[PDB]
Design a protein around this ligand. Sequence first.
Ligand SMILES: COc1cc2c(cc1OCCCC(=O)Nc1cc(C(=O)Nc3ccc4sc(C(=O)Nc5cn(C)c(C(=O)SC[C@@H](O)[C@H](O)CS)n5)cc4c3)n(C)c1)N=C[C@@H]1CCCN1C2=O
Ligand SMILES: CCOC(=O)c1nc(NC(=O)c2cc3cc(NC(=O)c4cc(NC(=O)CCCOc5cc6c(cc5OC)C(=O)N5CCC[C@H]5C=N6)cn4C)ccc3s2)cn1C
Length: 217
Amino acid sequence: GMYDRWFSQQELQVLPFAEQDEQRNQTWLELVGEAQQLMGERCPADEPRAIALATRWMEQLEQDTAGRPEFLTRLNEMHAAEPQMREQTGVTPEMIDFITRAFAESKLAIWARYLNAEELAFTRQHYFDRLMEWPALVADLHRACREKRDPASPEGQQLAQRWLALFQSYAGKDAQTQQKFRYAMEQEPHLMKGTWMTSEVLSWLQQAIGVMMRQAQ
Ligand SMILES: COc1cc2c(cc1OCCCC(=O)Nc1cc(C(=O)Nc3ccc4sc(C(=O)Nc5cn(C)c(C(=O)SC[C@@H](O)[C@H](O)CS)n5)cc4c3)n(C)c1)N=C[C@@H]1CCCN1C2=O
Ligand SMILES: CCOC(=O)c1nc(NC(=O)c2cc3cc(NC(=O)c4cc(NC(=O)CCCOc5cc6c(cc5OC)C(=O)N5CCC[C@H]5C=N6)cn4C)ccc3s2)cn1C
């Protein structure tokens, strides 16, 4: 079995995509149908329909991976490697790329109200630079939260420093710009949609960052 070569039996018990679910299949039929439509029209990634689709799409993926970021990586790799996956779902690499760009536009459209033109141009340019490293970090943040580790611990501060590096890769290294991203997150919860970042894990990360800022302040 395809799913058996890609996931452990313990993972297949927790993976919603493993379970039969007619509602979920109908939802994905509609998501893929709308993607094909918009791509057929050559709809730009910043069009309101593209932004709305990408948001719903990523929220659906968050549900169907049970909020486990490492299952997103696995599913992307399966789609790249397994012709049977592309047949089953109708999701093409072009489609994943379209959704990836529209999802970025959905964040940039919110940030545009909190950043100056220069900060937004930097973030638009550098958004994708280290994008692929986020799932592994979000996974480790999920583990640190569940294993109720101390944000102030050396291992907690290793996660805070890893977060800072990935964040600065798209935000830049200006302390004032970082506070604008923080303010945007506080004012616009919709920024967190499709990021695998639950309020519980964000709260833990916020504590770890708090410690990091005050040590060498
Ligand atoms: C030590 O503190 C406490 C201790 C105790 C406390 C409380 C405590 O709380 C007080 C601390 C509160 C505080 O001053 N905090 C803080 C914060 C900041 C700050 O700068 N935040 C920030 C900025 C930008 C982003 S941007 C962001 C973020 O996450 N971005 C992001 C996420 N993703 C996923 C991405 C991506 O691009 S990936 C995109 C997707 O498509 C992928 O697919 C993902 S899979 N970007 C976060 C932030 C945060 N500053 C400056 C300060 N109380 C309890 C305990 C009990 C005993 C005593 N205690 C305690 O000991
Ligand atoms: C870097 C970090 O990662 C990212 O940033 C990122 N990762 C992503 N990943 C994705 O987008 C992903 C999407 C999905 C979707 C799934 N979907 C499913 O499991 C699924 C779908 C379904 N679907 C169905 O029941 C509907 C019947 C099949 O429909 C068709 C079938 C159909 C074609 C067309 C079809 O419909 C129009 C076709 O023309 N065809 C196309 C060629 C073949 C021919 C025949 N087949 C069920 N399930 C269970 C699973 C995993 C992923 S991962 C996106 N971003 C932004």
